[PDB]
Design an enzyme around this catalytic site. Structure first.
Site, PDB file in Angstrom:
ATOM      1  N   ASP A  55       0.864  -1.170   0.000  1.00 54.43           N
ATOM      2  CA  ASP A  55       0.000   0.000   0.000  1.00 54.43           C
ATOM      3  C   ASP A  55       0.913   1.237   0.000  1.00 54.43           C
ATOM      4  O   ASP A  55       1.743   1.417   0.902  1.00 54.43           O
ATOM      5  CB  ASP A  55      -0.955  -0.017   1.210  1.00 54.43           C
ATOM      6  N   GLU A  65      -3.855   4.484  -2.320  1.00 55.87           N
ATOM      7  CA  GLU A  65      -4.269   4.111  -0.972  1.00 55.87           C
ATOM      8  C   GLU A  65      -5.773   4.229  -0.779  1.00 55.87           C
ATOM      9  O   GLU A  65      -6.392   3.289  -0.266  1.00 55.87           O
ATOM     10  CB  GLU A  65      -3.535   4.942   0.087  1.00 55.87           C
ATOM     11  N   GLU A  66      -6.353   5.396  -1.134  1.00 59.23           N
ATOM     12  CA  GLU A  66      -7.783   5.669  -0.957  1.00 59.23           C
ATOM     13  C   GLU A  66      -8.633   4.690  -1.733  1.00 59.23           C
ATOM     14  O   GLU A  66      -9.583   4.154  -1.138  1.00 59.23           O
ATOM     15  CB  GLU A  66      -8.157   7.127  -1.276  1.00 59.23           C
TER      16      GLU A  66
END
Ligand code: 70J
Length: 505
Positions: free
Chosen positions: A279, A297-298
């Site tokens: 990540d 990431e989101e």
């Protein structure tokens, strides 16, 4: 026109024996292990709700110490929450007014535009009809059930701690329904020092402004809440905070390079199945998942929502730390990225579960550096930092080399962070080698980068150079091409320098 290079992805170590799951000094287990069975929803341990309200644990919305001032008198905030959420929302304003009933101080700071626009301007009548009638009532039900679901005090994975929290997916859903409804106390004001080193948990910021992306984030999240409320999830999830005291002496590391698969096609979630998925993290885990942010990431935190819960107990990541999340499920399929991200369809994760009923999915949160100026990334301390960052996330203290799956990675810390793809690629390759793991590298449409990473790897492998031998070449590049290099771009690039320094020796 070969779409991938190196070792075949079929030869790369893919996963999944496990030691008996039990609570310990450095391990929190919030469910009944004796009763943990496949296909069966876990029973929470203890039976009756146990409260903690201290600087070492999560402040639960259902606590008897969760109170608000009244005209005299201190009322219970959990009673307020119940009384507030047990009404029938049939218009967006009904939900805004319910969240604000137990969040008075923010009634004029919190904007609900995106929530209004999604319900009134994005959703179709029948779709919005399914929202206020089915999903939302069912969301309130699992949120209000929290004392029965999360009976054991959850510790905060604070900086320096080497601790793990194993908890059921059902427990995570009750917890995330509370974050949607903005029920977590002492996590709202931007001026407090109690949780300033912790990321935002309550979903208030998802409801603000007119970004075309928020309806897409909301569609993603509601797909999750619809799933978990319809059928109770049966599995578990482990959240480990790994802090390292002793780091390698990079310059004197005798280890050779491991194997590499490098491609300009595929994704980390699809092609990295049964591998340690990286990540591209923010020091505050999850970045802007609950707000404006919508990148690597989101997107993952949206497609795999049980990742969002790490924000409740994970203190800001210091250089020597990483967060390991094992057992998260993928509820959504998506299209695009950043400003073009779109929620595709519902996904049925067909991953197997291990002896701890955790989905055979492992993700590592490793934060990269934010380079003020582009030349700063070649500064020794900064290359040593990224090498220690990656090493931490890759290293498994007490695990044998053969029982470690490949690392599924890509362009980590490259966008608004300024990272040199070619340098980062070498740092990751050197980190993985020091932690005896092969590398599966995704270049995201970049055909050139893939050829360049492959060639460098093959050049270093054949001429048989150690981690120390390569690290010493990066120190030479700073000295020769950066130390007194005033111009924003150095005369000669990194890989040409590496071929030069070795060939001429
Ligand atoms: C910088 N960047 C990425 O880092 C990236 C990473 C992924 S992933 O990490 O595999 N998957 C996710 C986002 C974790 C779930 C997927 C797509 C990406 N894209 C979009 C793209 C792909 C292919 C051609 C053109 C654009 C991108 O631009």
């Amino acid at each position: 026109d070969k779409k991938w290079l190196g070792t075949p992805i079929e030869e790369m170590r893919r996963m999944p024996r496990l030691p008996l799951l039990r609570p310990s000094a450095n391990h929190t287990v919030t469910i009944r292990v004796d009763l943990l069975r496949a296909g069966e929803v876990p029973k929470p341990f203890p039976t009756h709700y146990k409260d903690l309200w201290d600087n070492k644990h999560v402040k639960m919305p259902c606590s008897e110490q969760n109170l608000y001032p009244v005209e005299d008198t201190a009322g219970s905030r959990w009673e307020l929450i119940q009384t507030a959420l047990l009404n029938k929302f049939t218009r967006p304003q009904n939900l805004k007014d319910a969240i604000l009933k137990y969040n008075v101080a923010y009634s004029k700071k919190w904007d609900f535009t995106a929530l209004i626009d999604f319900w009134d301007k994005v959703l179709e009548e029948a779709e919005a009809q399914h929202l206020y009638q089915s999903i939302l009532p069912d969301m309130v039900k699992i949120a209000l059930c929290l004392p029965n679901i999360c009976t054991q005090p959850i510790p905060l994975l604070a900086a320096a701690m080497n601790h793990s929290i194993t908890m059921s997916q059902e427990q995570i859903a009750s917890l995330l329904a509370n974050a949607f409804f903005c029920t977590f106390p002492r996590r709202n004001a931007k001026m407090k020092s109690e949780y300033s080193s912790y990321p935002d948990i309550n979903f208030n910021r998802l409801f603000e402004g007119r970004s075309s992306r928020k309806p897409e984030k909301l569609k993603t999240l509601f797909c999750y809440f619809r799933r978990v409320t319809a059928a109770a999830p049966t599995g578990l999830v482990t959240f480990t905070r790994q802090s390292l005291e002793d780091f390698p002496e990079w310059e004197r590391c005798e280890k050779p390079l491991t194997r590499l698969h490098v491609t300009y096609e595929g994704t980390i979630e699809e092609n990295g199945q049964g591998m340690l998925q990286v990540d591209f993290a923010n020091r505050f885990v999850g970045g802007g998942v609950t707000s404006a942010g919508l990148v690597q990431e989101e997107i993952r935190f949206l497609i795999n929502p049980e990742l969002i819960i790490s924000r409740l107990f994970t203190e800001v990541l210091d250089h020597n730390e990483c967060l390991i999340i094992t057992g998260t499920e993928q509820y959504s399929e998506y299209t695009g990225y950043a400003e073009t991200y779109r929620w595709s369809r519902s996904h049925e994760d067909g991953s197997e579960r291990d002896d701890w009923q955790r989905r055979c999915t492992e993700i590592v949160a490793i934060d990269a550096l934010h380079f003020r100026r582009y030349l700063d990334q070649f500064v020794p301390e900064k290359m040593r930092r990224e090498l220690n960052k990656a090493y931490c996330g890759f290293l498994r203290p007490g695990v044998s080399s053969e029982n470690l799956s490949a690392v599924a990675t890509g362009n980590w810390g490259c966008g608004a962070f300024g990272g040199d793809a070619r340098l980062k690629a070498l740092i990751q390759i050197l980190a993985a080698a020091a932690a005896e793991r092969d590398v599966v590298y995704f270049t995201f449409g970049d055909s050139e980068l893939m050829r360049d990473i492959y060639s460098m790897h093959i050049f270093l492998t054949e001429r048989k150079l150690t981690v120390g031998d390569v690290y010493k070449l990066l120190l030479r590049y700073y000295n020769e091409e950066c130390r007194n290099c005033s111009t924003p771009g150095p005369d000669i690039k990194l890989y040409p320098f590496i071929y030069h320094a070795v060939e001429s020796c």
